Amino acid sequence: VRYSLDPENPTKSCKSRGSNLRVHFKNTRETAQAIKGMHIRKATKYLKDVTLQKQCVPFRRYNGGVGRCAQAKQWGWTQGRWPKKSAEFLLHMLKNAESNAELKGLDVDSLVIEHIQVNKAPKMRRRTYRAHGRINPYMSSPCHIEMILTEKE
Amino acid sequence: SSHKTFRIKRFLAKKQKQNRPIPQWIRMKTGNKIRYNSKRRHWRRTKLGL
Amino acid sequence: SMLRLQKRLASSVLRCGKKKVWLDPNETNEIANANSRQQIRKLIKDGLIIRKPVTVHSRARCR
Amino acid sequence: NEVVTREYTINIHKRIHGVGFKKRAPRALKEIRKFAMKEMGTPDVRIDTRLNKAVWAKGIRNVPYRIRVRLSRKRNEDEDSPNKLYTLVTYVPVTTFKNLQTVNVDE
RNA sequence: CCGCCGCAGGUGCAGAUCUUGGUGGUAGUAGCAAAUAUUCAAACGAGAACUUUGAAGGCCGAAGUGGAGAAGGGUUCCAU
RNA sequence: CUCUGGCAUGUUGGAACAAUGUAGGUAAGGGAAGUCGGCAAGCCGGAUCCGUAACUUCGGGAUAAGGAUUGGCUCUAAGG
Ligand SMILES: [K+]
Ligand SMILES: [K+]
Ligand SMILES: [Mg+2]
Ligand SMILES: [Mg+2]
Ligand SMILES: [Mg+2]
Ligand SMILES: [Mg+2]
Ligand SMILES: [Mg+2]
Ligand SMILES: [Mg+2]
Ligand SMILES: [Mg+2]
Ligand SMILES: [Mg+2]
Ligand SMILES: [Mg+2]
Ligand SMILES: [Mg+2]
Ligand SMILES: [Mg+2]
Ligand SMILES: [Mg+2]
Ligand SMILES: [Mg+2]
Ligand SMILES: [Mg+2]
Ligand SMILES: [Mg+2]
Ligand SMILES: [Mg+2]
Ligand SMILES: [Mg+2]
Ligand SMILES: [Mg+2]
Ligand SMILES: [Mg+2]
Ligand SMILES: [Mg+2]
Ligand SMILES: [Mg+2]
Ligand SMILES: [Mg+2]
Ligand SMILES: [Mg+2]
Ligand SMILES: [Mg+2]
Ligand SMILES: [Mg+2]
């Protein structure tokens, strides 16, 4: 297991990763960038509000055709969405990172997400049928997610 | 069809008996490279042609 | 649970359609562990499964 | 006063004004459900089967204009659920809707 | 595995609507709009717009969205 | 339209009701002035009783054209 970045103080850090997660990479990357540098309690509350469509994930890089919302004015952006599945996958991973911090005996309500990385994973093959007897790719874009949480005063 | 000759029925018998997964203990044998039956026929995908 | 087998079996035993079979919505656990026609018959005798009446199509207007 | 019961007239006609024919009865159920949340101040609103039957009594598009309901807030302590209080909406058949006003129901 | 002296060649790619394999921008876009229609409650379950049960409202409307066959399929049948 | 029997709206759901569409409909007064062209739409429409032209291979044309009537209720007469 090599995270892209080694933690500064390994004894004050917890890590969690997941591979080949059937969640949209583009949606998850935008979501992870939103919770980067957040406290774990703030991130947990924020992601649940995304699932409830009370706070939006601003789509800054993969925004082609993404609609505008009023909740994006809180990120200094005009385009936002509420990707539910990406938030649940990140929420599931945050809890696992939280359990890892407890297993290492770390102050849970001091952890901050310092590093979070979403990588495209191998695609999975599905087919769609087009006009004139043509078959086109219908591909899934999973992702590999990793994060490292560190205590902050 | 419900109407079938003995030769066609016996032919369909062999095709059903062959369409089974590999025994799990095949994999444990030395010099094994067969990780899954690559000759599995699904009735709706590929037809026998008879 | 899932009562497709019991709904199918009851319709065969009661000789009616599946739309006229009534499985008790309260005692579904006893209906669920009935996987034979013998047990379906007993549930019919016990009153758990009943045959609903035909929908009324009156000819009084025609008469 | 966590547990309280009140009777209310909901003007379904104003709530479902402009809705399409195939959506008028289902929207009436949604408008009742969100009427309960605003009044009783709790999510997890349960609509009695008889109130559903009453809204659907005249088909999917000719929903009754007014309906008399009984909102009874009760404790959801029977289950380990995130909501402690839930509202059960029940049907109150009436002959007329004139001079009928929101009223409290005593246990 | 290489230097030097000779020997030998299927010996040097940017192109050929080149060949094969892989990968992007398009793009989280087009789209998931033919045939009227779903709703309430409960169950099971980690999880329910979609499963099951009950209730309601609908449709097929006997030239059927019903009940059985031929050809063809070949186990798709049934239970877990 | 309904009963028996079957089904869950035809590979998704939620919210909204902008333009432009696809499908349907209505429109004062005029009435083909539109357009290559009445294209499209519209008019007509069942039945009963009247009334039906040119032409004709005497068979047709013919539901020509044109006109009236049509519900409900209570009776009367006739037809075994
Ligand atoms: K056949
Ligand atoms: K003209
Ligand atoms: Mg857009
Ligand atoms: Mg928006
Ligand atoms: Mg296609
Ligand atoms: Mg084809
Ligand atoms: Mg085929
Ligand atoms: Mg060579
Ligand atoms: Mg060469
Ligand atoms: Mg090249
Ligand atoms: Mg060149
Ligand atoms: Mg789109
Ligand atoms: Mg679409
Ligand atoms: Mg029809
Ligand atoms: Mg019908
Ligand atoms: Mg017909
Ligand atoms: Mg539809
Ligand atoms: Mg559906
Ligand atoms: Mg289909
Ligand atoms: Mg009008
Ligand atoms: Mg006009
Ligand atoms: Mg006029
Ligand atoms: Mg005129
Ligand atoms: Mg002109
Ligand atoms: Mg002109
Ligand atoms: Mg025409
Ligand atoms: Mg003529």
Swiss-Prot record, chain A:
Name the cystine pairs. Answer: none
Q: Name one GO molecular function term.
A: RNA binding
Q: In which tissues is it expressed?
A: Expressed in pancreas, lung, colon, cystic duct, gall bladder, kidney and liver. Expressed at high levels in the well differentiated pancreatic tumor cell lines HPAF, COLO 357 and Capan-1, the moderately differentiated pancreatic tumor cell lines T3M-4, AsPc-1 and BxPc-3, the poorly differentiated pancreatic tumor cell line MIA PaCa-2, and the pancreatic tumor cell lines of undefined differentiation status such as SW979. Expressed at lower levels in the poorly differentiated pancreatic tumor cell lines HCG-25 and PANC-1.
Coiled-coil-forming residues are none
Broad class of where this protein is predominantly found: cytoplasm
Function (record text): Component of the large ribosomal subunit. The ribosome is a large ribonucleoprotein complex responsible for the synthesis of proteins in the cell.
Quaternary context? Component of the large ribosomal subunit.
Per the record, the similarity remark reads: Belongs to the universal ribosomal protein uL22 family.
Q: What's the protein name?
A: Large ribosomal subunit protein uL22
Q: Which gene encodes it?
A: RPL17
Curated annotation (Swiss-Prot), chain B:
An annotated GO BP: antibacterial humoral response
Q: Which InterPro entries match?
A: Ribosomal_eL39, Ribosomal_eL39_CS, Ribosomal_eL39_dom_sf
Q: Does the keyword Ribonucleoprotein apply?
A: yes
Pfam families in alphabetical order: Ribosomal_L39
Q: Where in the cell is it found?
A: Cytoplasm
GO MF annotations, alphabetized: RNA binding; structural constituent of ribosome
**Keywords, alphabetical:** Cytoplasm, Ribonucleoprotein, Ribosomal protein
| GO cellular component assignments | cytosol; cytosolic large ribosomal subunit; cytosolic ribosome; extracellular space
Q: Does the keyword Chloroplast apply?
A: no
The similarity annotation says: Belongs to the eukaryotic ribosomal protein eL39 family.
Listed under subunit, the entry gives:
Component of the large ribosomal subunit. Interacts with IMPACT.
What the protein does comes down to: RNA-binding component of the large ribosomal subunit. The ribosome is a large ribonucleoprotein complex responsible for the synthesis of proteins in the cell.
Question: What is the protein's name according to its record?
Answer: Large ribosomal subunit protein eL39
UniProtKB/Swiss-Prot annotation, chain C:
Instruction: Tell me where in or outside the cell this protein is found.
Output: Cytoplasm
Q: Which residues carry this modification: Phosphoserine?
A: S12
Q: Point out residues bearing the modification Citrulline.
A: R4, R15, R37
What does the entry's PTM section describe? Citrullinated by PADI4.
Q: Describe the task this protein carries out.
A: Component of the large ribosomal subunit. The ribosome is a large ribonucleoprotein complex responsible for the synthesis of proteins in the cell.
- Give the UniProt family note: Belongs to the eukaryotic ribosomal protein eL19 family.
The subunit structure is:
Component of the large ribosomal subunit.
Protein name as it appears in the record = Large ribosomal subunit protein eL19
Q: Which organism is it from?
A: Homo sapiens
From Swiss-Prot, chain D:
GO-annotated cellular components = cytoplasm; cytosol; cytosolic large ribosomal subunit; cytosolic ribosome; extracellular exosome; focal adhesion; membrane; nucleoplasm
Q: Can you cite a GO biological process for this protein?
A: cytoplasmic translation
Localization: Cytoplasm
Please give the SMART domains that the UniProt record associates with this protein: Ribosomal_L31e (SM01380)
Looking up InterPro entries in the UniProt record yields:
Ribosomal_eL31, Ribosomal_eL31_CS, Ribosomal_eL31_dom_sf
GO molecular-function term, one example from the UniProt record = structural constituent of ribosome
Which residue positions does N6-succinyllysine occur at?
K38, K53, K58
Q: Look up the domain of life of the source.
A: Eukaryota
Keyword list, A-Z: Acetylation, Cytoplasm, Phosphoprotein, Ribonucleoprotein, Ribosomal protein
Residues where Phosphoserine is found: S81
Give TM regions: none
- N6-acetyllysine modification, residue list: K58
Coiled coil residues, start to end:
none
Please give the function described in this protein's UniProt entry: Component of the large ribosomal subunit. The ribosome is a large ribonucleoprotein complex responsible for the synthesis of proteins in the cell.
Q: Which family does it belong to?
A: Belongs to the eukaryotic ribosomal protein eL31 family.
Quaternary structure?
Component of the large ribosomal subunit.
Which protein is depicted? Answer: Large ribosomal subunit protein eL31
Q: What species does this protein belong to?
A: Homo sapiens (Human)
Gene name per UniProt = RPL31
